[PDB]
Amino acid sequence: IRRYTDQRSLDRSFGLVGQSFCAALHQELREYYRLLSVLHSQLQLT
Amino acid sequence: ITEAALVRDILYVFQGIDGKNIKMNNTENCYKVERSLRDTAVRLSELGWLHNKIRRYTDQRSLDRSFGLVGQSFCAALHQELREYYRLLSVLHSQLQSLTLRRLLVWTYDPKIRLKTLAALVDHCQGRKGGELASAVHAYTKTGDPYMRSLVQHILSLVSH
Amino acid sequence: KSPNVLLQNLCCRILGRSEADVAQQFQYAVRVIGSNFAPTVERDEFLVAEKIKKELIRQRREADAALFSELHRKLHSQGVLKNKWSILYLLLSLSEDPRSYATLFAQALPRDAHST
Amino acid sequence: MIHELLLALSGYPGSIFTWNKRSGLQVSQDFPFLHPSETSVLNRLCRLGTDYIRFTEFIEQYTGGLHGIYLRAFCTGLDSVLQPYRQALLDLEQEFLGDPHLSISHVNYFLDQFQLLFPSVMVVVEQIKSQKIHGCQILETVYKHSCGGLPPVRSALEKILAVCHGVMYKQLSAWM
Amino acid sequence: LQQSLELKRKMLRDKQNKKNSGQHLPIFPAWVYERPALIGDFTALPIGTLPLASQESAVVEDLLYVLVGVDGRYVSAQPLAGRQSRTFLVDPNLDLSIRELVHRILPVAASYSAVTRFIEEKSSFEYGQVNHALAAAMRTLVKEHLILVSQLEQLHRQGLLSLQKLWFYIQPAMRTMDILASLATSVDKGECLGGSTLSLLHDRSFSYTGDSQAQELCLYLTKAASAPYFEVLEKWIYRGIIHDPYSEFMVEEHELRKERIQEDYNDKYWDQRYTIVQQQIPSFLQKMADKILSTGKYLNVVRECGHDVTCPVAKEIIYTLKERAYVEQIEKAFNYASKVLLDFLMEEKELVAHLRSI
Amino acid sequence: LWEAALTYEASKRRCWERVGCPPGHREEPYLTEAGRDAFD
């Protein structure tokens, strides 16, 4: 999913609806990294 | 070394007098620390290196009465600008009981632009009086930066009185 | 005193009415203040000083920002306050014109990277 | 210390700001709490004090050689220009009693408008002594610098000049 | 490095020959170019042999310096102060897990270093008022970045910052800095100034309608850069007067009232005196491109005869994407101008008696 | 209760030597100018 997002913003022919589709492919990486951050805080786990 | 002693020094190299472990050895150069801290200091001391020129010129021409009334007016405007710089430095002195943010890199940034413009103007208007001087200030409102146009347009209203 | 009666005192302060004349507003007050009896963010008193500056320049009331620059020093100089963030953030929140965007300007530290 | 400076500004400097007859208020005393570069700041400030000190001597002799009634009038307007220089000195110590955190910079910016007032009036005072301007030609010698070009000296010498005109309506009433 | 000194003089020569009494136009002095500490991007023991939970705090601290342009002490920015490029050398010994993420955090630093030079270069007089205003509005977001990094420094000061948290914090600013850096590269690359860098910004402003995260950034930069041009436009429309200090405007004035007086063999006033320029059209006024000239030309050729200047209503106009209000205002003023000139023609010095007596 | 007590007027008789908050505490009154009890 990150491979795709890295390429569709490297295309200006994927569309003005492709830069709408890709908008909820940025949020879908941002929330993942948020979750890794919260996981980092409680390390000092099973 | 602790950071706060360096804050004390950099608050004085704004005036154009060297600090205790920051000294300037070449006149073209700027104030150098005498490792990452050493790299950080120079951007802050730029404002004092600019300050020396403007201060020396509005000191000199104000006592000159063969220079004429026009431009003693320029010195009037420049002097009133320098007073506000000193107001800032006093607030910064008094606020001690970190406290500085990036060693005040975010603070000095807004005076930096209004120092750059006034540092340009003095050699752009060097050796002029009257309408010859006034035209070189009217040149500086062909700019398209709102803050710089605002900075220039009150100085012009003073000098052409 | 105690917080619950202090909120009732606030309700009798802003409204002209007394506390035995209104009970829905105090009910709405216990609804909203409740489970938020502490800041949900982390304090940045420096930024909220910068936000009063960023506000007064935005109004082009630039002289009172430089007046606040000395009043903040007086705040530090006295030092009877350990919550300088709360009242000043609140005063900024109740902002009224003496007479844009903040979606790109930075907001308070949300603690979404720390287990609250 | 917050009266020693505010008297070295006026007329009594002590041993920290030793007076010299040519021009005084010299500093060589060391303190850890005054910055090593702050001696230069204090030297910038003492220029202001020397002119006030000389002004006080000039008023002390007045109010032959150079004499008349104009030296007893021109000095009296020189009082009136120095009055916001005294009021703003009282205000300072009133402020410093309450807040201890205000530094040398506060007196520096606050009394920065007399670094245009004091030298450009001092040149008029020295000119009237070195030259022999002590009759009714005093109004001319001030009337060329009252036009000014810096706003403090534009406003001060007028306030002195009005009283000299006031002497010129008593000669021209007895005569006329 | 050297290349900036070239561009300004080439741009300045057009306005120096264009101006026929405007001699010695303003330029910035030499120390603006000599001194390198006016851009933001101009102990030493190896951190890699330390334990992990020392390494994370230390790397966050160094990168925090790298963001605002100055180097670290364990990572160095490699010397590439010329073009919009900037390179970095990460420490050659590090835990690979950390080092990969460090490389991943690096792109926003290059898309900061490119950004900060542009603000210095295209605010000088040779670059023109619209290019000044665009620089003045991206500088606000640079100041905003300086605002964010201090809060990060405060959180790190209380010992509660590590690399995963830092990556999560920098993700919103990375997109913003990316939009600004791509726009900066586009503006310098076409070497466009005046109204051409309203066309570039018009197309770039239309380009995002699906994201709307980047549409607001560019739309604000367009409002700021369209501010001077619209004022010159209001001068031209509502009375008659253009100055054009640094070329940003489509109308230019070529004088021909030198050869003969009060006869026209070409009708040069109505023809090749006041002409249009194809490339200073900001690419949304191409439809109105003739009417904008005719409106202001009609007023000069009636203020010359001795008639009073009039405008219907003086209004200030802004750039709006999707629903123009400025165009409809221009149409009303244009009709009023043509009506006034025709009114003046058909009553005094009338064409009716002329045509009858022919 | 605390804010209710707060609304009071603080004394004068300022002192030069107090730089840290000089409201007033009377630098030793005069002997006669405390009369009618000092007298007897």
Half-sphere exposure (Cβ direction) of E341: Cα atoms closer than 13 Å: 17
Mutate to test the interface with D, among B15, B66, B99 (most CBs of D within 10 A): B15
Please give the Cα distance from A22 to D45 (Å, whole number).
65
Instruction: With beta carbons under 8 A apart, name residues in chain D contacting F21.
Output: 98
Q: Which residues of D touch B68 (CB under 8 A)?
A: 149
Is E213 an 8 Å CB contact of chain C? no
**Chain C residue closest to E160 (CA)?**
C114
Name which of B19, B75, B83 is nearest D112 (Cβ-Cβ).
B83
Helices (H), F1-40: 2-6
CA distance E161 to chain C (A): 9
Nearest Cα neighbor of B43 from E138, E63, E36, E86 is: E36
Contact E211 A18 (CB under 8 A): no
Cα–Cα distance for residue pair D137/D144, rounded to 1 Å: 12
SS3 at position A33: helix
D150 to chain B nearest CA, in Å? 6
Question: Which chains pack against A, by 3+ Cβ pairs within 8 A?
Answer: C, E
Q: At what angle do helices B36-63 and D114-130 cross, to 10 degrees?
A: 40
- Name residue, tokens 């665009």: E134
Nearest Cα to F23, choosing from D97, D91, C75?
D97
The CA distance from C91 to A36, in Å, is 36
The whole-angstrom separation of Cα E209 and Cα B51 is 47
Cα B148 to Cα B121: distance, rounded to the nearest angstrom: 12
Specify whether the CB–CB gap between E318 and E222 falls below 8 A: no
* Cβ–Cβ contact E213 with A under 8 A: yes
User: What's the Rg (C-alpha) of chain C?
Assistant: 17
Q: After which residues is chain B broken (C to N over 2.5 A)?
A: 34, 97
Q: How far apart, in whole angstroms, are the C-alpha atoms of residue E92 and residue E99?
A: 9
Q: Chain A neighbours among E 145-164 (CB < 8 Å)?
A: 162, 164
Q: Which residue of C has its CA nearest to E152?
A: C109
Q: Which two tokens stand for residue E355?
A: 């045509």
Q: In whole angstroms, how large is the CA radius of gyration of chain B?
A: 17
Residues whose CB falls within 8 Å of the CB of residue B85, separated by 6 or more in sequence, listed in order: B14, B51, B111
Interatomic CA distance for residues E298 and E301, integer angstroms = 5
Distance from CA of C102 to the nearest CA of B (A): 19
Q: Three-state secondary structure along chain D?
A: CCCCHHHHCCCCCCCCCECCCCCCCECCCCCCCCCCCHHHHHHHHHHHHHHHHHHHHHHHHCCCCCCCCCHHHHHHHHHHHHHHHHHHHHHHHHHHHHCCCCCHHHHHHHCCCHHHHHHHHHHHHHHHHHCCCCCCCHHHHHHCCCCCCCHHHHHHHHHHHHHHHHHCCCHHHHCC
Cβ separation of E150 and C101 shorter than 8 Å? no
Q: Is C19 on the interface with E (CB under 8 A)?
A: no
Q: Which chains touch D (3 or more CB pairs under 8 A)?
A: B, C, F
E171 touches chain A (CB under 8 A): yes
> What tokens appear for E78 in the block?
């490699």
Nearest CA in chain B to E226: B144
Residue labelled with tokens 């006080």: D56
Distance CA D63, CA D82 (A): 16
- C-beta of residue B102 within 8 angstroms of C-beta of residue E153: yes
User: Token pair 């993942």 is at which residue?
Assistant: A32
Report how far residue D148's alpha carbon sits from residue B76's, in angstroms, rounded to the nearest whole number. Answer: 11
Q: Which of B62, B76, B94 sits opposite D103 (nearest CB)?
A: B94
Q: By three-state DSSP, how is residue A11 classified?
A: coil
D40–B89 CB contact, under 8 Å: no
Q: Report CB contact under 8 Å: E176, C104.
A: yes
SS3 E77: strand
Q: Do B91 and C73 touch (CB under 8 A)?
A: yes
The nearest CA of chain C is from the CA of A32 a distance in Å of: 12
Structure tokens at D139: 């109004």
What whole-number distance in Å separates Cα of residue E158 and Cα of residue E165?
Answer: 14
Q: Do D100 and F19 touch (CB under 8 A)?
A: yes
E167 at interface of A, judged by CB pairs closer than 8 A: yes
CA distance D34 to C42: 38
Written as six digits, the tokens of F11 are 């004394």
Chain-chain contact of A34 with C115 (C-beta, under 8 angstroms)? no
Q: Does E45 touch chain C (CB under 8 A)?
A: no
**Are residues E37 and B49 in contact, defined by beta-carbon separation less than 8 angstroms?**
no
Report d(CA B52, CA B68) in Å as an integer: 23
- Supply angle C-alpha E89, E91, E96, rounded to 5: 115
**Nearest-angstrom CA–CA distance, E123 and B144:** 8
CA distance E69 to E58: 17
**What are the residue ranges of helices labelled H in chain B?**
3-13, 36-63, 69-94, 109-124, 130-138, 146-159
Residue (of E231, E246, E336) closest to E291 by Cα position: E336
* Four-residue CA torsion sign, E293, E294, E300, E303: negative
Q: Which chains touch C (3 or more CB pairs under 8 A)?
A: A, B, D, E
Cα(F30)–Cα(E273) distance, integer angstroms: 97
Whole-angstrom Cα distance, residue C86 to residue D145? Answer: 56
Q: Is C115 at the interface with chain A, CB within 8 A?
A: yes
What whole-number distance in Å separates Cα of residue E315 and Cα of residue E304? 25
From the list C46, C70, C79, the residue facing B91 with the nearest CB is: C70
CA–CA dist A6, A1 (Å, integer): 9
Dihedral angle at the C-alpha atoms of B131, B132, B137, B138, nearest 10 degrees? 60
E306 sits in the region (left: phi over 0; alpha: psi -120 to 50; else beta) called left
Chain B positions touching E128 (Cβ under 8 A) are 144
Size of interface C-E (CB pairs under 8 A): 33
Yes or no: say if A36 and E164 are a contact pair by the CB < 8 Å rule. yes
Phi-psi region of F27 (alpha: psi -120 to 50; beta: other; left: phi over 0): beta
Chains touching F (at least 3 CB pairs under 8 A) are D
Length of chain C: 116
For the packed helices E129-157 and E107-121, what is the interaxial angle rounded to 10 degrees? 140
Task: Annotate F1-33 with b (16+ C-beta within 10 A) or e (fewer).
Answer: eeeeeeeeeeeeeeeeeeeeeeeeeeeeeeeee
Residue F8 DSSP class: P
- Which residues are registered as beta bridge partners of D26? D18
B touches E, CB cut-off 8 Å, minimum 3 pairs: yes
Which member of E162, E165, E209 has the closest CB to residue A16?
A: E209
DSSP E253-299: E---TTS-SS--SS-GGGSTTEEE-STTS-SSSSTTTTHHHHHHHHH
D97 vs F contacts (CB less than 8 Å): 14, 16, 18-19, 22
